[PDB]
């Protein structure tokens, strides 16, 4: 006690005399990994399909903040500023003084205080979390419930006309008595026994956990007008947000594309997944309750009309619009149809992607279907709110549903070279598959291994060998892994079969990446999450962890090749990554493969003077895109200006 009181109390304080604050850094360019080394390719850049743009919208917002929370488990100052701008916590005003102001209280915030005053709020608002209603309506309208009561009694009424009373009692007059009331200028129907009346009680199953959009997502802050947001469906609103994000993140306008190619060589194949489930239930609830819904929403509720709004407003392309529905691989099949259109020559810049939404009808139907995570079962097992989605884990009992998706921008290598565009990856192979005869529906699919028939004579191996990627160079598998009891070990079996069909050397590792633990199973817009994740992995070299994994399931142990990662492996110039493989095992007998190769394949295809000038122009366009986002985040001149 007497030698503990002395040292702890009189511990002196030493503060530096300079002591200046720290401010969020100005937008500097990206720092990628030191790129790998392979030889010049004999492939001409007319025969390459590259991924130039790309943006997403999901449970963490943009792909920047989603990847930052994916890797380093915390946001940077720019990510905090972006999410606080987006979720309405911060506005820019300049009438007292130019600066960011708080929304509810209205004060000049300091840039030094941004993270330390706004990190916890956006971490609460952003992530896998409990269902929070963002419709500003009553939750007691949409739930199945049984009522059957029979009524034999008096009917008190309202002032209607004689014709309206007669039209009411048109169905009635064999089960009732009619009495006229001249004081109300109407009739009164009074129905006998056997008359049932609908008495709608609406139940409440509480605490659905999901992967919603950030709470308070205001798409008007991008630049979309309020009448646009009110009239148009919110899937199309999100599609406009994602598309303008992709173009202004890779530094375009579609006007420059129209300068360099003809408008019939630009397509748009954004096949939205289901197409306005919320919009259709909104139509029917307005039809029942008498809400003045517009009389053309039955026309423009269709799923093609989302990207038709995108074409008739933003891109103006005359080209081949194909909108596919497979409802858990829409983005994958849209990407493979965009790439084989470019392999034809029907187009030279394709905007592909897809979006999803969970409804009350969606969660009720999936709860009746019972392959999703039961909240009561998981809280009986004692699992917290942010870790329901646990792929390759022993305590997995179904998937977590999320809402979102996005868009990617495919382009031919000739446009990429001629415009100087930032190539994010090189698409080597994209393909979809069926599964065949399985009358018993709990029997899952396996027939996505048709890409590897013949060993080295297979088209997958042949395309990788054209790009100069051997069988052992495939390093990272971004698996589907919805965290159900069924689709994890058979997909492990599928990638094992593809590995020893391509002739993988014995014991070469495959880094398993599975970010469905992070986001959730957005249904038809998951392949855009996987492609943005794999492009960013091939850029930076890092490998993200599976933070919701505790114990790897036992029957995966036969896999001779996988590496399940639990901590952020930072691969600098220590282990170069050269390829990556996706899968998407969609709903109802559909599968999809797509490989991706590091952009130095594109840089190695061309000639050694044009490669230097190309790197100059592409780095300039990336830097200009992110500092244009910084100008929009601070001052004004907002994105999506409509002439």
């Amino acid at each position: 006690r007497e030698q503990m009181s002395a040292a702890a109390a009189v511990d002196e304080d030493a503060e530096a005399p300079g002591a200046i604050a720290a401010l969020p850094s100005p937008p500097r360019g990206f720092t990628p990994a030191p790129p790998p080394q392979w030889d010049d390719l004999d492939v001409d850049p007319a025969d390459l399909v590259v991924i130039v743009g790309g943006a997403e919208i999901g449970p963490y917002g943009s792909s920047r903040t989603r990847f930052e929370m994916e890797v380093e488990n915390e946001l940077s100052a720019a990510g905090v500023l972006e999410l606080a701008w987006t979720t309405g916590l911060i506005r820019w005003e300049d009438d007292p003084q130019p600066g960011w102001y708080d929304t509810e209280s209205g004060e000049m915030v300091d840039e030094s205080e941004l993270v330390q005053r706004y990190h916890d709020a956006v971490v609460q608002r952003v992530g896998i979390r409990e269902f929070v209603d963002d419709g500003a309506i009553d939750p007691d309208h949409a739930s199945p419930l049984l009522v059957s009561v029979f009524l034999e009694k008096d009917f008190a009424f309202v002032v209607s006309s004689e014709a309206d009373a007669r039209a009411f009692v048109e169905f009635d007059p064999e089960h009732t008595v009619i009495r006229p009331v001249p004081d109300s200028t109407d009739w009164q129907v009074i129905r006998k026994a056997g008359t049932e009346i609908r008495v709608p009680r609406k139940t409440k199953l509480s605490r659905v956990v999901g992967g919603q959009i950030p709470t308070g997502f205001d798409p008007t802050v991008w630049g979309i007008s309020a009448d646009m947001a009110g009239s148009i469906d919110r899937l199309a609103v999100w599609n406009m947000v994602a598309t303008v994000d992709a173009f202004l993140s890779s530094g375009f306008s579609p006007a420059e594309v129209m300068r360099y190619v003809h408008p019939s060589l630009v397509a748009n194949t954004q096949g939205t997944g289901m197409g306005g489930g919320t919009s259709m239930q909104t139509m029917y609830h307005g039809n029942l309750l008498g809400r003045n819904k517009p009389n053309d929403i039955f026309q423009e509720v269709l799923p093609n009309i989302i990207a038709a709004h995108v074409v008739q407003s933003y891109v103006g392309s005359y080209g081949a619009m194909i909108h596919p529905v497979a409802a858990c691989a829409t983005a994958a099949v849209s990407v493979e149809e965009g790439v084989d259109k470019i392999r034809l020559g029907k187009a030279q810049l394709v905007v592909a992607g897809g979006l999803d939404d969970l409804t009350l009808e969606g969660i009720i139907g999936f709860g009746d279907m019972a392959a999703t995570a039961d909240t009561s079962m998981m809280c009986g097992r004692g699992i917290h709110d942010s870790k329901f989605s646990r792929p390759n884990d022993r305590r997995r009992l179904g998937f977590v549903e999320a809402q979102g998706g996005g868009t990617i921008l495919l382009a031919r290598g000739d446009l990429a070279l001629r415009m100087g565009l930032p190539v994010l990856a090189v698409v080597a192979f994209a393909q979809s598959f069926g599964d065949g005869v399985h009358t018993s529906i709990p029997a899952p699919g396996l027939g996505a291994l048709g890409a590897g028939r013949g060993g080295k004579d297979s088209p997958l191996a042949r395309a990788l060998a054209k790009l100069g990627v051997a069988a052992d160079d495939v390093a990272v598998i971004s698996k589907h892994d919805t965290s159900t009891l069924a689709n994890d070990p058979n997909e492990t079996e599928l990638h094992e079969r593809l590995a020893d069909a391509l002739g993988r050397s014995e014991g070469a590792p495959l880094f398993v990446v599975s970010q469905k633990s992070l986001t959730g199973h957005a249904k038809g817009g998951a392949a855009v999450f996987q492609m943005m994740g794999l492009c960013q992995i091939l850029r930076d070299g890092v490998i993200p962890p599976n933070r919701s994994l505790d114990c790897v399931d036992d029957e995966l142990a036969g896999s001779a090749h996988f590496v399940w990662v639990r901590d952020t492996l930072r691969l600098g110039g220590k282990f170069p990554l050269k390829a990556g493989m996706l899968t998407s095992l969609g709903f109802g007998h559909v599968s999809g493969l797509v490989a991706l190769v590091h952009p130095q394949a594109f840089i190695a295809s061309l000639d050694p003077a044009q490669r230097a000038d190309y790197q100059r122009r592409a780095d300039a366009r990336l830097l200009a895109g992110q500092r244009r986002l910084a100008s929009a985040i601070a001052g004004g001149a907002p994105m999506y200006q409509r002439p």
């Binding site: 014995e506 590792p509 505790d550 142990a557 001779a560 399940w564 990662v565 639990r566 282990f575």
Partner: protein
């Protein structure tokens, strides 16, 4: 009348001090070593060659009980280290493959141990670490099971695990006879969870061999509680541990005769006198 009877006799906070915590749905199994072995093979390549000699025996002996797969991947990393020219790493991965081939069970083979009261930085935690290092089947009890402790026990397993070691982790109050009886029934008969269409096999059946009652009673001092505390902690030692040894000796009785449980008692001047008084009952 009954609640102020219990208030006058035992204490005011008696039901919350004695309330049962145990539930068999919240048991956590940590028996994955092959996966963490593969990831450790990767991060040995990521760490530089200068810091390998600082842990050269330890890194050679962590991968002793592992699989054929870990052996083959160690040979792959050896070949790539020879190609790159990392002479320390090449011999290290050769040593790792040669060690991971070996099939023999360890020091503590099949010794189903039960350790109570293993917190962060404690003698019971070090005993759990050495038992997992030998390759035992440890069943650790703890008070509350949350994110911090779950991360702690998971990193404890992935650091100190070897050959066929398994760590099971339950939340059980060591001051409730209901929890002690439920805990010995759980360690006794199996636990098979069944969903709708089918069933899931979880816990086979277990008969223990060791027992380590290091149960810390309570760390609360903001109540002026010493009169009731001076008997409640004496409960927590004496009758909890002898009820425990009775149950654990009972559960493997008629199946396996001549199979004898083994207990190690801790005794921690006046504290040693209290310990000896706890002994000679």
């Amino acid at each position: 009348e009954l609640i102020d009877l219990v208030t006058a006799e035992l204490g005011a906070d008696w039901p919350r001090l004695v309330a049962p915590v145990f539930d068999p749905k919240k048991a956590v199994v940590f028996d994955d070593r092959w996966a963490s072995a593969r990831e450790d093979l990767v991060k040995l390549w990521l760490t530089d060659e200068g810091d390998i000699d600082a842990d050269w025996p330890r890194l050679a002996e962590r991968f002793e009980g592992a699989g054929h797969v870990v052996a083959t991947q160690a040979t792959w990393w050896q070949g790539k280290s020879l190609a790159a020219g990392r002479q320390i790493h090449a011999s290290l991965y050769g040593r790792i493959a040669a060690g991971a081939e070996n099939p023999e069970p360890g020091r503590y083979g099949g010794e189903v141990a039960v350790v109570t009261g293993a917190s962060k930085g404690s003698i019971a935690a070090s005993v759990v670490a050495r038992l997992l290092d030998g390759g035992a089947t440890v069943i650790a009890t703890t008070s509350k099971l949350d994110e911090e402790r779950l991360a702690f026990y998971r990193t404890l397993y992935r650091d100190h695990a070897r050959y066929g070691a398994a760590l099971w982790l339950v939340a059980a109050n060591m001051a409730s006879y209901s929890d002690v009886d439920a805990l010995v029934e759980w360690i006794g008969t199996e636990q098979t969870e069944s969903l709708g269409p089918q069933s899931i096999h979880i816990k086979d059946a277990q008969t223990p061999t060791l027992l380590f009652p290091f149960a810390a009673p309570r760390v609360v001092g903001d109540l002026s509680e010493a009169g009731s505390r001076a008997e409640m902690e004496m409960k927590v030692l004496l009758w909890a541990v002898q009820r425990l040894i009775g149950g654990l000796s009972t559960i493997g009785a008629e199946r396996d005769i001549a199979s004898r449980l083994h207990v190690v008692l801790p005794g921690s001047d006046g504290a040693y006198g209290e310990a000896k008084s706890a002994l000679d009952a």
